[PDB]
């Protein structure tokens, strides 16, 4: 279908085809040499240059080499600098360049490539949608929003644009506004809309506004393979890990960690209160839009498996105690942190991002009335000096209606069924 050959390339099609046959037969090293010779003999040939880039791309997959891929990324750009490049080939080459820049984490680089694509192909809506994803991947939600607004003003029923616009509105706490965009977008069935992120956030926006249709979307998201269940809606999962909302210490196997937290809970409490009293700005406000109302702040000692040295200056004995327990200090998908929540707080039903951790809570200052936590269908309370353990990839919800503050210590552990290999290899969250 695509027209990749300019006038001159059509005259050398036999040599170009021979080289591409070598790549398709998996003879990647012979194919790079064949296209390198064609680039030498025919330095202005766009098809020869694209073949070299594609072979380098395949070679980077074979060798699993970022450096080889950076070479391919440069050659794809070279294609676009040559004279007379057919439009289909220019679009293929820069699109793959951007895609590979993203694979490498070169998000600013990918963004420049996508901006260039939109300038070169000003009527191609899918390229603007791709540029919007570029902005979202670098956290620039304001520019992503402007991009999807432009797309929607030309093509108002583009479902990819609607679900991404809906995602942005929801992230900005424009909850009611986000619902029709997320809903219509998923309903379009357009490519790219069948995505657990959009089911997750449509259901959640619905819950926040009191729309009882929420769980029908969770059910559909489960049927479509996006969620382990309607209750457990995390999106960064390892399939097959034991799934239950509440755990006992013995079920986790981390009984030595739990005994240490419970034997030594007063030191952990006292260091948290000293920060409250003398260094309270180390407690940072919860910043993931999880509160309906109230005040909730957290003081983090470890995140992504990395000790915060300045924070541990503020709780040195607690950090010394916890460093004996790599099941939590090396949990690169969880945190170790103090949490303070005050009366008048309600935390929306929500889900953490991953089924790869379990969340321990050690009670430190627990008012006798008014504090409770629901996980899935079961609500519990805390006790001073005692650990509760739940899987926060299940929907959970908290109310603080006491007459004084609540302080807990949160300790994430690797899910116990994860092998050491997985604990080494899983990307941090």
């Amino acid at each position: 279908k695509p027209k990749l050959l300019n006038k001159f390339d059509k005259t050398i099609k036999a040599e170009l085809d021979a080289a591409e046959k070598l790549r398709k037969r998996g003879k990647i090293e012979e194919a790079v040499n064949a296209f390198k010779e064609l680039v030498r003999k025919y330095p202005q040939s766009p098809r020869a240059r694209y073949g070299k880039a594609q072979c380098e791309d395949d070679l980077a997959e074979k060798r699993r080499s970022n450096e080889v891929l950076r070479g391919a990324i440069e050659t794809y750009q070279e294609v676009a600098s040559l004279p007379d490049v057919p439009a289909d080939l220019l679009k293929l080459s820069l699109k793959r360049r951007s895609d590979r820049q993203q694979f490498l984490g070169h998000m600013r680089g990918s963004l420049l490539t996508l901006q260039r694509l939109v300038q070169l192909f000003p009527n191609d809506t899918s390229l603007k949608n791709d540029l919007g994803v570029g902005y979202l991947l670098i956290g620039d939600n304001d520019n992503a929003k402007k991009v999807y607004e432009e797309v929607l003003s030309v093509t108002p029923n583009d479902g990819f644009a609607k679900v991404h616009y809906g995602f942005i509105l929801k992230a900005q706490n424009k909850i009611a506004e986000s619902i029709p965009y997320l809903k219509e977008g998923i309903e379009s069935g357009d490519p790219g809309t069948d995505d657990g992120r959009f089911y997750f956030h449509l259901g959640d926006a619905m819950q926040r506004v009191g729309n009882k249709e929420a769980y029908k979307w969770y059910e559909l998201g489960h049927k479509r393979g996006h969620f382990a269940s309607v209750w457990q809606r995390s999106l960064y999962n390892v399939n097959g890990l034991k799934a239950q909302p509440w755990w006992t210490p013995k079920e986790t196997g981390y009984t030595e960690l739990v005994k240490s937290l419970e034997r030594n809970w007063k030191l952990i409490r006292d260091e948290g209160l000293a920060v409250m009293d003398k260094a309270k700005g180390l407690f940072l406000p919860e910043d993931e839009n999880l509160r309906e109302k109230g005040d909730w702040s957290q003081f983090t000692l470890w995140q992504q498996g990395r000790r915060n040295e300045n924070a541990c200056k503020g709780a040195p004995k607690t950090c010394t105690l916890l460093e004996k327990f790599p099941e939590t200090t090396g949990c690169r998908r969880g945190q170790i942190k103090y949490s303070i929540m005050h009366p008048g707080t309600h935390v929306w039903p929500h889900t953490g991002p991953t089924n790869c951790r379990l969340r321990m809570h050690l009670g430190l200052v627990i008012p006798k009335e008014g504090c409770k936590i629901r996980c899935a269908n079961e609500t519990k309370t805390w006790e001073e000096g005692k650990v509760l353990i739940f899987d926060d990839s299940f929907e959970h919800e908290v109310w603080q209606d006491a007459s004084s503050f609540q302080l807990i210590f949160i300790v994430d552990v690797w899910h116990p069924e994860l092998t050491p290999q997985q604990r080494r290899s899983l990307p941090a969250i």
Partner: peptide, 18 residues
Amino acid sequence: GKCKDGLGEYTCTSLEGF
């Protein structure tokens, strides 16, 4: 922006190639 307690970011992991 990291996904610490929730799932609010467009992606929660970092991209580092192979």
